[PDB]
Paper text:
Using a differential scanning fluorimetry (DSF) assay in an RT-PCR instrument we screened a fragment library of 505 molecules identifying 16 molecules that significantly increase the thermal melting point of the purified periplasmic domain of [name]. Whereas docking predictions are increasingly reliable, the design of inhibitors requires high-resolution structural information and towards this goal we soaked [name] crystals with the binding fragments. Surprisingly, molecule 1E6 (2-furoic acid) bound to two sites on [name]. The first binding site is in the inhibitor-binding surface groove, whereas the second molecule binds to an α-helical region at the dimerization site of [name]-like proteins as was predicted by docking. To our surprise, molecule 1E6 also binds to an alternative site that is close to the dimer interface of [name]-like proteins. The discovery of this novel binding site opens additional opportunities for the design of small molecules that inhibit the functions of [name]-like proteins. Since both fragments bind in close proximity we reasoned that combining them may generate small molecules with higher affinity. In silico docking predicted that all these molecules bind to one or both of the 1E6 binding sites observed by X-ray crystallography. Addition of the fragments as well as of the derived small molecules that do not stabilize the protein in the DSF assay at concentrations of 50 μM has no effect on conjugation.
The conjugative transfer of plasmids between Gram-negative bacteria is mediated by type IV secretion system (T4SS) and many pathogens such as Helicobacter pylori, Bartonella and Brucella species use this strategy for the transfer of virulence factors into mammalian cells. T4SS typically comprise 12 membrane-associated proteins that fall into three categories: cytoplasmic ATPases (VirB4, VirB11 and VirD4), surface-exposed pilus components (VirB2 and VirB5) and core components associated with the inner and/or the outer membrane (VirB1, VirB3, VirB6, VirB7, [name], VirB9 and VirB10). Here, we conducted a fragment-based screen to identify novel chemical entities that bind to and may identify novel druggable sites on [name] and other [name]-like proteins. Also, our data demonstrate the existence of two potential druggable sites on [name].
Numbering used by the authors:
A (entry chain D): 94 to 230
B (entry chain A): 88 to 230
The structure:
């Protein structure tokens, strides 16, 4: 669909998935779902299982924000690499935690299937992640 | 592919900032791409006003060529999704290739009207403007 369009969804995916804010985890959880193959999807849903679920554990005690630093592409393969930075924030503390720099190896593709009302505000192009992996530097 | 004013905050912002970058940047290496993009992402009236500076012997790319470049930096975006209106503040940094350093930055405000339209679209057209985003009004002023 073009590089800049590819970079948008990819970065929005990282932001959606690697961020934590309680009052927006529900839409974030939804986006990651639509933007992921079911097997890649429920590998992430593992964070939200039982009553030890991330949102159900952390509650609103803290928040983690994401910062996109760079985005390289490999268009034919449908592969991309995203370096990003996370900053955790405990609401009780007076200061942000020290940043953490990560790398995200991603595979992606496009298949606009069941065009639904609540999808076309999230993934209109049918962007989906095929392989997601994250590591530090 | 579907008539609607908005696609939400983050999707609207993407196209809008992409439009400003395409339209307010100048890079000879990418101008053909930028020029096509603005054309597809514009109503005919917005398009014709923009395309005007490229027509003729003194067409911008015919005059400037690769002698210089201007890059854009988006500072902020304020959406009014219900009415398809947006305000974008951005900075341009011009570089004349015959100078050792860049020009001083300039600050601008873009008042924009936008929408999405379902229209007939070929292969390499959908590849640039899949959702049929287009600017319906556009005026830039200095900060």
């Amino acid at each position: 669909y073009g590089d800049e369009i590819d970079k948008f969804w990819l970065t929005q995916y990282v932001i959606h998935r690697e961020s934590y804010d309680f009052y927006s985890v529900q839409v974030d959880y939804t986006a990651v779902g639509l933007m992921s193959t079911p097997n890649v999807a429920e590998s992430y849903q593992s964070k939200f299982k039982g009553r030890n679920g991330l949102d159900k554990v952390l509650g609103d005690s803290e928040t983690t924000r994401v910062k996109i630093n760079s985005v390289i592409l490999d268009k034919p393969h449908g592969v991309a690499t995203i370096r990003f930075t996370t900053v955790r924030r405990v609401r009780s503390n007076p200061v942000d935690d020290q940043p953490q720099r990560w790398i995200a190896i991603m595979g992606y593709e496009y298949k606009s299937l069941a065009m639904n009302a609540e999808q076309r505000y999230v993934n209109p192009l049918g962007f989906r992640v095929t392989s997601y992996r994250v590591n530090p530097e």
